[PDB]
Design a protein around this nucleic acid. Structure first.
Lengths: 223, 278, 50, 55, 141, 73, 36, 106, 22, 70
RNA sequence: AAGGUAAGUAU
């Protein structure tokens, strides 16, 4: 909603990008290709998650393959549509009202399931409940965790986590909720795949990373 | 070396001069030219090769922008039919285009960038520029220029061909680039410098074939971990069982060696007080 | 208290058992067990799991 | 089947005799030496050893 | 308050730089009355106690010794020339003039690191050495 | 064209004094030694020949003596 | 010691006061003024 | 093959000086390094034609106490440009080599 | 199958000629 | 385009927040189901130190291996 | 404008 927030975040994102660029060399790149700043560290890159919208040029979306029969060439971003752009953060973030509604619905379903399974002469199924996986503001994904009995003893950890700023000398951005206590509310798994495939695929990304300079086809399993 | 850099980048500059330390460009050029000479000499029968030599190349002419000095010269016996210049991907050939008694082969050591990695286009442009130039001096007007993109590790060639040597030259280039000594050393240097360790191999955890081939193994031994950690336990109706350690020997054996190993150690040394299995 | 002059490092003239005992007592044996190698493929963890 | 050494009294006594902190020498079985084929010498020894582990 | 040794005569600075052994001679050219040069002199004084074992600082006045102004192109304030081992070292810190530090260091620890790197490079025998911190940008933001 | 040739049988191979197939590291060592015009030092040559002798001895192949000694009480 | 003796320090301070007339001398003429 | 070394064998305490500049090493440098009163040796290996020293020299003294003193006295400090390194001379003659080869069995 | 020894040029530390010997 | 990241305001109306946000799936669901089945089998089946040196056994997060919500 | 001089070695 806040246009000013978007403007400031894009401005400081460009600030950090320029800091990386000047760290690379004193001058300023004329083009500054974005493959370096968005390739995940698994593939050997900075992997900067960004909320902006930068369209990757098609000129850098091509790649080659020196097969024995011949030197083949491919272009992942050859679709006749808008130029490939790195997806922004909000594209895979659940709306807060949606989060609350889903939490209410999933908790009602879990309560109904527990009531039904009480008469089953056994604990909850914990398998059919997978239809409600990774949902709810409380850690419903961690509702079947082993440490729950250990976690049930703690009461009101929110105030302790808040005062950790006066306890810990380092800033804690995740003071809204504690990890492994309220669960990983934000599911960021598809973001990595979307970013790597929208950059031109694994081969397209590696085409500019000296990977072809090693004779071994270590596409997978390399350390 | 022959790596062109735009804008001074101290990190890239230092990394490149580490990778290409000790005249590595001249070394790989000499390796490739020697491999080509040996390959040509080995198959000199079908190629009607009378002399296969190299000129007195200036030491700096390995990384030079223009190949003023030819790399390999090959003189046949009487005549040699050469077709029009083309790329290795082509198939058609009309050897009646020219008839010369000499032939030249040039190796272009190039470092491809993210946009200048087109070996075939680079090969075509470089052949056209070098062959048609006043500064470049080629003893023979008919020949082929080869190019190796080190960063791309891609081999290519362009120009005329000896009758029936085009598949031979393609196969020779592929085989040499597969296991060239200096190229392998450069690849190992790159792997070390970038800290990209080669994918770990899978040990033959299977032993059914190993059991039959146990005598084939030069040296082999096996040791029982539980034997070293084995602790004799007493028996009592009311008293606590005394699970005292027995000994430190691991009951090691080596049938291929014709003997066995007895790493006998003290029971207390084998297992101390309140010592876990780990 | 002036800072010591950073002279170029000189290796041990002769590796002794007592020197090896110090190496056994103090060293990077435990750090070597933890492998810092990272697979080229993506890991199951999130981008910023930390 | 390393349990043969524990099962065998001679090696079982050697287990007690292994209480000395110094390393000991364990000679190979005479059945392996008696067998003509060294490749099958282990198999003959293992076959007896495996049955000893079972019973 | 500018109590570091100062070369009254130009030739005295020359023989002082010549009379060096296993030490780095940081000759700080400029004038004490300049404010930026005063800050540089204060930083050098702070460093002097900590690194006096191998780093010796020996200031000089351009007006008192103008013969060396044209020798190394001394036409800026706060200039520092690490004339060590009777050899003008090439200290590169992301600047066009990689043989002269002509501005007071923001922090003393940075200057200490720079001078110890210079000492290491000089002892190794190389005439050039780089800086761990590039000064192409002032990190203003 | 009309050059009905045959598939070449020439393969990459490197031959030392003994004719064994050298490792690429040894091949590059020979390359550099030829390039600089001089090889390794005397101590390095002694170490190399000792390693070669050890490898030759290992390829040609002590428990019999141990068994004979253990036969006596 | 590394630092100059007392006489040298006094001479340096006198020179600084004579040159920099902003905080020294009868009048503040200029930063690099020979006479304040 | 080194008759001069046999004449230099009189002084037992022989030290190997390393990291010598081609022009830095000289007889005057050895004399400046001759702190102990015992006779020194300024011999350093050099090219046959150009005389460019390879950086290795040997200094012989008849006093092992002076040897020990100079081992730490002149380690890293030398008058010329290239700093000096000192090592215990592991030099061997052909007779010692033959004896070692004979005794290598056990 | 036979393969003779491979010779090489000693360009480094060679004052005999400016150009590499052939 | 690669020079800098464009501001989101221009393409704000392109889509909505969490347009392609998908929920996660449990890990080792089949293994947990197998462990639960084996444990239930054992449960309904139940409801319905020698002198040898090697006799002793060899004594070599927040996930419910049994796969039952406690 | 620039922020892009490798050092070393005797001539």
């Amino acid at each position: 909603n806040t246009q000013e927030l978007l403007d400031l975040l894009v401005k400081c994102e460009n600030k950090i990008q320029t800091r990386i660029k000047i760290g690379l060399n004193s001058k300023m790149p004329s083009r500054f290709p974005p493959v370096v700043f968005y390739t995940p560290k698994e593939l050997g890159g900075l992997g900067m998650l960004s909320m902006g919208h930068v369209l990757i040029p098609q000129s850098d979306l091509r790649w080659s393959k020196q097969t024995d029969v011949g030197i083949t060439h491919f272009r992942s971003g050859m679709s006749h549509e808008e130029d490939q752009l790195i997806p922004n953060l909000y594209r895979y973030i659940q709306p807060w009202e949606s989060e609350f509604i889903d939490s209410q619905r999933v908790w009602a379903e879990y309560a109904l399931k527990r009531q039904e399974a009480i008469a089953q002469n056994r604990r909850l199924t914990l398998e059919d409940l997978e239809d409600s996986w990774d949902r709810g503001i409380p850690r419903i994904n961690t509702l079947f965790q082993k440490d729950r009995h250990t976690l049930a003893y703690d009461k009101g950890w929110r105030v302790r986590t808040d005062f950790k700023q006066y306890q810990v000398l380092k800033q804690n951005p995740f003071w809204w909720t504690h990890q492994r206590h309220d669960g990983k509310l934000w599911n960021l798994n598809n973001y990595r795949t979307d970013m790597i495939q929208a950059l031109g695929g694994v081969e397209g990304i590696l085409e500019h990373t000296l990977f072809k300079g090693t004779y071994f086809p270590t596409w997978e399993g390399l350390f | 070396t022959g790596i062109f850099m735009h804008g001074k980048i101290p990190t890239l500059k230092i990394s490149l001069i580490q990778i290409f330390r000790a005249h590595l460009w001249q070394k790989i050029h000499e390796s490739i030219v020697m491999d080509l000479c040996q390959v040509f000499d080995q198959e000199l029968d079908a190629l009607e090769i009378e002399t296969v030599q190299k000129e007195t190349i200036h030491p700096r002419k390995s990384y030079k922008m223009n190949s003023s000095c030819a790399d390999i010269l090959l003189f046949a016996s009487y005549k040699w039919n050469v077709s029009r210049p083309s790329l290795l991907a082509d198939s058609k050939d009309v050897m009646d285009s020219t008839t010369t008694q000499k032939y030249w082969i040039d190796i272009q050591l190039r470092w491809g960038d993210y946009d200048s990695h087109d070996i075939e286009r680079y090969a075509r442009a470089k052949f056209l520029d070098y062959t048609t130039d006043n500064m470049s001096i080629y003893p023979s007007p008919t020949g082929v220029l080869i190019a190796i993109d080190l960063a791309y590790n891609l081999h290519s060639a362009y120009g005329n061909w000896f009758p029936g040597s085009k598949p031979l030259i393609q196969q020779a280039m592929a085989k040499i680039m597969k296991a060239n000594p200096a190229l392998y050393v450069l690849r190992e240097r790159i792997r070390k410098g970038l800290q990209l360790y080669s994918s770990e191999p899978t040990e033959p955890y299977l032993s059914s074939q190993n059991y039959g081939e146990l005598f084939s193994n030069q040296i082999i031994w096996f040791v029982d971990d539980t034997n070293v950690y084995r602790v004799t336990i007493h028996k009592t109706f009311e008293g606590n069982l005394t699970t005292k350690p027995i000994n430190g020997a691991i009951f090691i054996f080596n049938p291929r060696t014709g003997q066995l190993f007895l790493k006998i150690i003290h029971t207390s040394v084998w297992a101390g007080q309140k010592r876990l299995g780990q | 208290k002036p800072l010591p002059a950073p002279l170029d490092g000189q290796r041990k003239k002769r590796g002794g058992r007592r020197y090896r005992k110090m190496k056994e007592r103090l060293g990077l044996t435990e750090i070597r067990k933890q492998a810092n190698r990272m697979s080229f493929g993506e890991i199951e963890e999130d981008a910023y799991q930390e | 089947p390393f349990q043969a050494c524990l099962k065998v009294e001679k090696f079982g006594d050697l287990i007690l005799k292994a209480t000395e902190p110094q390393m000991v020498l364990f000679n190979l079985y005479d059945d392996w030496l008696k067998t003509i084929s060294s490749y099958t010498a282990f198999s003959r020894l293992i076959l007896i050893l495996r049955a000893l582990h079972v019973n | 308050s500018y109590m570091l040794p100062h070369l009254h005569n130009g030739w005295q600075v020359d023989q002082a730089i010549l009379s060096e052994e296993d030490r780095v001679v940081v000759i700080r050219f400029g004038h004490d009355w300049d404010p930026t040069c005063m800050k540089m002199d204060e930083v050098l004084y702070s460093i002097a106690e900590k690194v006096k074992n191998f780093a010796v600082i020996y200031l000089v006045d351009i007006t008192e010794v103008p013969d060396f102004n044209k020798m190394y192109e001394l036409y800026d304030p706060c200039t520092v020339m690490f004339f060590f081992r009777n050899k003008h070292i090439m200290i590169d810190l992301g600047t066009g003039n990689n043989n002269k530090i002509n501005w007071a260091m923001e922090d003393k620890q940075e200057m200490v690191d720079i001078i110890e790197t210079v000492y290491r490079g000089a002892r190794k025998g190389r005439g050039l050495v780089v800086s761990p911190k590039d000064y192409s940008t002032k990190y203003r933001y | 064209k009309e050059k009905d040739g045959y598939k070449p049988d020439v393969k990459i191979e490197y031959v030392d004094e003994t004719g064994r197939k050298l490792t690429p590291k040894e091949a590059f060592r020979q390359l550099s030694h030829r390039f600089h015009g001089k090889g390794s030092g005397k101590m390095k040559t002694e170490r190399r020949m000792k390693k070669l002798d050890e490898e030759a001895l290992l390829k040609k192949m002590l428990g019999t003596v141990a068994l004979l000694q253990e036969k006596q009480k | 010691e590394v630092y100059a003796p007392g006489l040298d320090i006094e001479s340096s301070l006198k020179q600084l006061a004579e040159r920099r007339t902003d905080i020294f001398g009868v009048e503040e003429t200029a930063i690099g003024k020979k006479i304040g | 093959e080194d008759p001069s070394l046999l004449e230099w064998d009189a002084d037992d305490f022989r030290i190997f000086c390393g990291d010598l500049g081609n022009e830095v090493n000289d007889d005057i440098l050895a004399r400046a390094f001759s702190r102990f009163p015992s006779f020194l040796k300024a011999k350093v290996i050099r090219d046959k034609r150009t005389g460019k020293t390879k950086g290795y020299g040997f200094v012989s003294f008849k006093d092992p106490s002076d040897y020990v003193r100079a081992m730490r006295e002149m380690n890293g400090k030398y008058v010329g440009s290239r700093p000096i390194k000192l090592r215990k001379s592991m030099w061997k003659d052909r007779n010692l080599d033959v004896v070692r080869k004979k005794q290598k069995e056990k | 199958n036979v393969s003779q020894k491979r010779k090489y040029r000693q360009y480094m530390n060679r004052k005999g000629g400016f150009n590499r010997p052939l | 385009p690669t020079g800098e990241v464009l501001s989101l305001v221009g393409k704000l109306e392109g889509t909505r927040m969490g347009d392609k946000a998908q929920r996660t799936k449990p890990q080792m669901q089949e293994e947990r189901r197998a462990k639960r089945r084996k444990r239930d089998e054992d449960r309904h089946d139940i409801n319905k130190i020698d002198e040898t040196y090697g006799v002793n056994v060899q004594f070599e997060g927040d996930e419910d291996v049994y796969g039952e919500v406690r």
